Amino acid sequence: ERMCGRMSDFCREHKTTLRYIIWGILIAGYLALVIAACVMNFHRALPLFVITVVAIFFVVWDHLMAKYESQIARFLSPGQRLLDSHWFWLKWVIWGCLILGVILWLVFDTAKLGQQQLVSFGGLIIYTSLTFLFSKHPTKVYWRPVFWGIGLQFLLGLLILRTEPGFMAFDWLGKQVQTFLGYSDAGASFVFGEKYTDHFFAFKVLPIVIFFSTVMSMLYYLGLMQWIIRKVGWVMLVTMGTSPVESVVASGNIFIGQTESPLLVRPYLPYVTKSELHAIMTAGFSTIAGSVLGAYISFGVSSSHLLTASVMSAPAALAISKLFWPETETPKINLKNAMKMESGDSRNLLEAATQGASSSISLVANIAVNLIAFLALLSFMNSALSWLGNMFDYPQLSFEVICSYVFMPFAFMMGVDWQDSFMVAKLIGYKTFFNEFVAYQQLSKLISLRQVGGPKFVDGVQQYMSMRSEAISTYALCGFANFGSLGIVIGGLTSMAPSRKRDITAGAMRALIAGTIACFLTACIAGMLTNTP
Amino acid sequence: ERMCGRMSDFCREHKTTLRYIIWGILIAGYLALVIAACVMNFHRALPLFVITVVAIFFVVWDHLMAKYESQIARFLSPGQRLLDSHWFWLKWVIWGCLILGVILWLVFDTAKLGQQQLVSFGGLIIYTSLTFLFSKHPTKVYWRPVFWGIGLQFLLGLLILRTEPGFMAFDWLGKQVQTFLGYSDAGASFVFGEKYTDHFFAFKVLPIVIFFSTVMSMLYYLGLMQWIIRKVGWVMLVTMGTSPVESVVASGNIFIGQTESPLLVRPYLPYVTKSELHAIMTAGFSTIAGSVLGAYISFGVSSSHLLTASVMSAPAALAISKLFWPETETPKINLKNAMKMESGDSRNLLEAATQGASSSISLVANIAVNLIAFLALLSFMNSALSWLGNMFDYPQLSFEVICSYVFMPFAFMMGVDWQDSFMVAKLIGYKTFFNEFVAYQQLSKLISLRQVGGPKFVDGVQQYMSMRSEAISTYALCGFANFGSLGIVIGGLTSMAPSRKRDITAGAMRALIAGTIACFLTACIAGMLTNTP
Amino acid sequence: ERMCGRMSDFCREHKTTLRYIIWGILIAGYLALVIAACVMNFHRALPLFVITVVAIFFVVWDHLMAKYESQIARFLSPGQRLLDSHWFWLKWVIWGCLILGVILWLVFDTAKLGQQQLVSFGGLIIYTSLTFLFSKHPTKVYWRPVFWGIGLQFLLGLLILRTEPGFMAFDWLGKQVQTFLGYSDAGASFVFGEKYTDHFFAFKVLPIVIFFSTVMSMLYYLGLMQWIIRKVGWVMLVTMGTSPVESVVASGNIFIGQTESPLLVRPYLPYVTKSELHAIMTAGFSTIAGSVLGAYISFGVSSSHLLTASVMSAPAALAISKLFWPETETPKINLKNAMKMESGDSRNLLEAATQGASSSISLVANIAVNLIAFLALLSFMNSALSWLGNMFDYPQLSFEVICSYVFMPFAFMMGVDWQDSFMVAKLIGYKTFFNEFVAYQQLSKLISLRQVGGPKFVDGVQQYMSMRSEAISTYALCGFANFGSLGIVIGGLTSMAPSRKRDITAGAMRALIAGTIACFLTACIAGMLTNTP
Ligand SMILES: C[C@@]1(F)[C@H](O)[C@@H](CO)O[C@H]1n1ccc(=O)[nH]c1=O
Ligand SMILES: C[C@@]1(F)[C@H](O)[C@@H](CO)O[C@H]1n1ccc(=O)[nH]c1=O
Ligand SMILES: C[C@@]1(F)[C@H](O)[C@@H](CO)O[C@H]1n1ccc(=O)[nH]c1=O
Ligand code: NA
Ligand code: NA
Ligand code: NA
């Protein structure tokens, strides 16, 4: 096989040029398709052109930043030195301008909107103050991350809620997801037949979870998830001044669950501080995963609000963690180590899809079994309470009544009016004790009742609430913070870092509370910007 | 934070008094509720008052026994010395009185009831004699546990079957369970829809198993299960003279499965004797779990009889184990070590509920798959036997016919009349080979046919049997002794105690046989007391 | 217990004779039943007599071969020496006779049948040549196994397709399986109710997989599977000259999956060569399992063709593996070590049934989830392609069109006519990317459309194809070679042999390609013998 040996030698000699030429040819073919499509019709081919343009821009930008990093840093250094020189007097001016802007915004927008928005602002202040009072180290507090996180949340809310561009962008993004979750119906129909709608939840909702997990694993294989995670983490790190590890984990928990997000930085867990570990757990508790998003949307919960809350939950999580448990040590991990994220052991895209599909079995199984047990326990508890309540001629006693009269202040501070606060408190209880699959399920019923348009009150019982309250509840409930999740979180984090078991158990409860508080802060910011119809 | 430090110091200084005061306040509130309810109406608040009274009595009793144990023992010692002094001649008197009582009971009750009850007594004697003949060490037999276990079974049967108080108590207890298993319908309806009754077994029965496992895990977390287990084990230990480990395991297997019951004494397994290990396996094989109770009740099997059999199966298991495999070594474990039972790694009640729910996935999955395979094999076997039977112009040959003509003597000795013995033998075969989920399922069909009231015989084929036979079959079938369970039992017990693998394999078959024999003994005792309608 | 000791001593003294006498009595009883059945009626009892006769013949043959092996070998040796002496000139005569026979068969059968059969022969030649060109070691090729495997495939095809005896035998064998898979309906009906047909796939097809896995585990416990495996492996080893390990694995993969077949030789995996490992993987990729056979038959795929393809896939796998990756080392394992296969840890038949049933849970779960994900991805891909295709006024672009225009040459070489090649290419794509559960599912639709008898063309779209194309597709698609299976195969084989991880990853892709090529070779041989209706 002399010819075969010569061919192998030729391939070895110019391996780099051959593959580069092949990739260039593929790129040229794609560009030819795009340009031909634009030529035949432009209005019809606009989205493809836009996608290609943005991809090209990002590729060029990344290449330039990687290549000319040192030159750009050197060019920026003089301005940084001048700003540091004049900061001792410029800080007061900047702070005064920001405070004046806050005051003007309040006076000219929030007061016009009404009283409930001012109550939302007051609730924000009150939650922050309460977190400060019960802090682990109240004296050793670094206030930069707190203010920066709250400001980032406010800016995101302004751009997405009070501007036509962001509103349109996020509505479109939500609509695309709603279309995307409809593809699982093919597999559900084949496996479970054309009668798969006889059992809506089991045979139509869970397949959405399966499909979303598959797609997420495929995206992780390709590397887009890590790209977006790094882009967001750099912003949060530069503005807020947090450590790279916690910033990366917070940015990744927007898309990934609390248990699987620490895997982004597996090797460096034994060397993190207590504060970073607490921030990791808090970020896990203050966000949801992309797999369960489709189920919540199927129930009827707004997609745009869910995405907005997931985005806003990260700065709030980091700020609340830093205030609740500030840093009193020296971090060891550096930016390059944190940003590098080890992709999985998948040889090709289809293997990644299979791996993602297989992992979803336990998820759906546990979801179903826990729902069964929780609802059975709820029924038993309500029956027992009615039995006890009949002694005092009050057989209407129930879990819902107690929770409505208990969690009312937390909902009132978020800006919910007096009447609907008692209804939001029930959802808060459902989430606090059982989980968020139940709270969103009841919220969907309330939304459907409003959409139907029946009587708001029947026999003096409120049947549904307003749009603003529904949005505020959507923001408040977006989290994984329940008493049950504490054990599984601790177990997983110990399994990843056996040596840090003593530290993990110490901060888990504070992390859970901080996650709940962060959800409430996001809800308050939402409420102070939405208007009363 | 000087104020915070002062508050922390104050909390540390008087930590004990603060929590004690809080608990006292909670207790006072509960008592205030109880007394107010009684004041408003007494007949309506009676059960709450009774529950509170019994709880108070048991708490006070436990405190007194723990505090004044030494004084009570010293006070009792003189009487024990006197009894030991006079025992050498008093033993004959006591034994003669007991024998005379047995004879009088036989003559004046059993003969009046009829012949079948005398046959039941004879079957009891015969099973005991057969266990003696095939004993591992016939010469080294300690007869105290045998007689004491049989006597405890007889006393329990008298109190629960032949007295209005016990009959009413256990009927009420059974009715409460039937009400309790109806709460799972809420979760089943949500997860599987309002059409969940289209698939009765899968979508209504298994959720009962899930809910019961959840409740059992919660009770184990609270500590009531261990309380009852210790109370029963002390009685069995004092009366029968067995070792603490086997007594505890037998008392715990009333509520817990054979695989999970040894976990009550995990550390001490390597140090147990062969006899104690055999007793453990026998107790596992002679009882059922509380999770599968609801399914059997849903089929239509009597709850009171199931509870009575589960209670009676422990003394029989221990007696049959001691007779089959008596003790020839010195036990090492002591009472304090055995009674202490390590609760699980659950931080709160809801985490315990989640853990219990998750563990139930494998249980129901295996139940369903094994049922599918066993019924398919049964159909294939029956078709093949009919094919073989057609050669001799007898195409009616089947598994049921062979089992009816094979297991008939075992059912006849239990007191089942001649006609119904052939029908009970089929259930015995179903249980011996496949499992008890099948035997109870067929028994439920027979019971339903009787309740309908159709012809007892159609074309010379008996369609149903009497009430007494159904009760005797309920007692006989209450066990986990099947040829399949041998492997899983051995695997689990080796996984708990790897070093004792050689001993575990040796006694497993004898334990299985002893469990079957114990079930039959319970059935014989039931039969000799029930009357022929 | 002196009598017991005497009985035990007597049993120990003559243990061998007692059990032998018992087995002889059982055999005599069985023979008495057989003879009585024949006496009462012979035509009715014929199959039982035939089964008994063949069993007796095989038992006697095995005993004689085991006992008189040395004498038979010595008797055969002289002829072997004479043949070796005259081989140097007799080889040319034998080869010329074989070539002349091939030429005559072509001229007088294949040409008469038509052009497509000649195209099938040419495709066979072309696939072999392509495997030779891209071989790992083209110079170091041992041609005996290649020709012998192709010849064995041709002989099997002649006996099973072009002779009434083999045709009848395999049709009968297929019909028995179709009857056998109907027994699972009992378990499916009980567990999932009389409405289990509302969800055909989930509640009727997967139980077939469960039941077949149970039966396979039972057969492995009994030892028939190993008997047949050894019988086939000896033939393949003697004729082809392959190593015992790869021959055994290839013979066992007819009935067993790719992951579980290497367990037949677990200990010797670390000591195999690279070529044997490659052959193992190739055999795994070129065959199916007996558990999934029932599902394919339920869809509507021919049973006889499936069995024939499974039988023919082993010689092709070995030949293609030897040509693609020939042997350049010295094998270490010997025949006695390879043939001995360690049965599982099952004490009795029912325990084996339970073990087989439990293992089937993961199989069906993964099947269902992967199907859901794959079909959802297919729908999304088709929608996206239609969106892209509308730019050029061609909204009909799809995965199916691309695959039809891509895989067409591979189907044309197999002998499929011009029109149906584009349809077979779609099935090839479905199998190559997703899996064979999808390709057979679509093939069943095509077969059903033909059976209905509607218009072959509607609006210029072909709705179904011919019988010959359906058979060729049945042969082509019988394999587990998909891009997804690469990862699971590698993981399992590394878990069995951790030390050989470097070698396993190297040959997996070549093994996958070789499996596909072997399937195509079987299809070509099928096509060159079937006639055009
Ligand atoms: C965290 C949860 F307990 C949730 O509370 C429950 C309700 O969604 O499901 C669990 N869950 C969900 C998604 C995920 O990715 N990981 C995970 O553990
Ligand atoms: C022991 C069993 F094989 C039973 O025979 C079968 C039928 O109930 O289910 C198994 N089983 C049931 C309850 C339990 O707690 N543990 C357990 O293993
Ligand atoms: C190999 C497979 F990926 C198949 O491609 C898929 C479609 O049948 O199921 C998997 N499978 C099937 C049978 C078996 O025995 N083992 C196994 O892994
Ligand atoms: Na998350
Ligand atoms: Na038990
Ligand atoms: Na196979």
Side-chain angles (χ1 to χ4, degrees), chain A residues 288-335 337-341 343-344 346-367:
Chain A
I288 53 162
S291 52
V292 296
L293 186 73
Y296 305 155
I297 295 179
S298 302
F299 293 166
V301 189
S302 187
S303 56
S304 176
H305 288 147
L306 282 171
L307 301 173
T308 315
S310 305
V311 174
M312 296 164 68
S313 292
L318 288 178
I320 298 292
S321 174
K322 292 289 116 175
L323 185 55
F324 218 46
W325 193 318
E327 184 70 309
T328 58
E329 311 177 22
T330 51
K332 303 178 183 179
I333 316 311
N334 64 282
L335 186 61
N337 297 17
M339 284 301 176
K340 84 177 60 163
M341 287 176 267
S343 180
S346 304
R347 282 134 280 269
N348 59 78
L349 195 62
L350 304 164
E351 188 194 340
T354 59
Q355 289 173 3
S358 64
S359 302
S360 62
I361 295 163
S362 55
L363 176 65
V364 301
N366 279 276
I367 287 171

Side-chain angles (χ1 to χ4, degrees), chain C residues 257-260 289 291-292 296 363 367 435-437 480 482 485:
Chain C
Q258 60 186 343
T259 42
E260 293 90 356
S291 52
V292 296
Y296 305 155
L363 176 65
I367 287 171
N435 57 7
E436 75 290 353
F437 246 87
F480 280 171
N482 22 85
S485 287

Side-chain angles (χ1 to χ4, degrees), chain A residues 33 36-37 40 44-45 47 183-184 187 190-192 195 199 210-211 214 347-348 350-351 354 357-358 360-361, chain C residues 139 198-199 201-202 366 368-377 379-380 383 387 390-393 433 441 483 487:
Chain A
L33 292 175
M40 297 185 68
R44 188 170 58 187
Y183 293 136
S184 58
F190 173 63
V191 179
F192 303 118
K195 288 179 174 292
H199 321 286
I210 293 167
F211 178 48
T214 300
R347 282 134 280 269
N348 59 78
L350 304 164
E351 188 194 340
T354 59
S358 64
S360 62
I361 295 163
Chain C
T139 58
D198 298 359
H199 321 286
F201 186 75
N366 279 276
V369 181
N370 276 263
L371 277 170
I372 290 173
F374 284 154
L375 276 80
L377 287 167
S379 61
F380 166 57
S383 68
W387 170 78
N390 200 345
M391 312 302 189
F392 315 91
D393 292 322
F433 292 110
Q441 155 61 4
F483 289 130

Side-chain angles (χ1 to χ4, degrees), chain B residues 104-181:
Chain B
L104 295 178
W105 180 261
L106 292 172
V107 165
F108 291 111
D109 186 305
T110 310
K112 272 57 178 175
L113 263 48
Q115 173 187 329
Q116 313 306 341
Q117 296 71 358
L118 295 166
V119 175
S120 291
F121 176 74
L124 182 146
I125 280 165
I126 279 163
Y127 285 119
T128 303
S129 302
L130 295 185
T131 55
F132 175 48
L133 284 172
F134 296 82
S135 189
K136 191 81 175 182
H137 317 108
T139 58
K140 303 146 172 178
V141 168
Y142 185 41
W143 287 99
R144 178 191 181 189
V146 184
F147 294 138
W148 262 108
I150 297 173
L152 292 178
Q153 282 195 117
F154 189 70
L155 294 178
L156 281 165
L158 283 182
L159 299 177
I160 301 167
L161 304 174
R162 309 230 77 192
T163 61
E164 187 183 8
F167 190 97
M168 284 181 166
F170 267 73
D171 192 5
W172 179 88
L173 218 56
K175 287 178 179 176
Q176 295 306 299
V177 179
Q178 214 171 5
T179 303
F180 194 67
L181 65 79

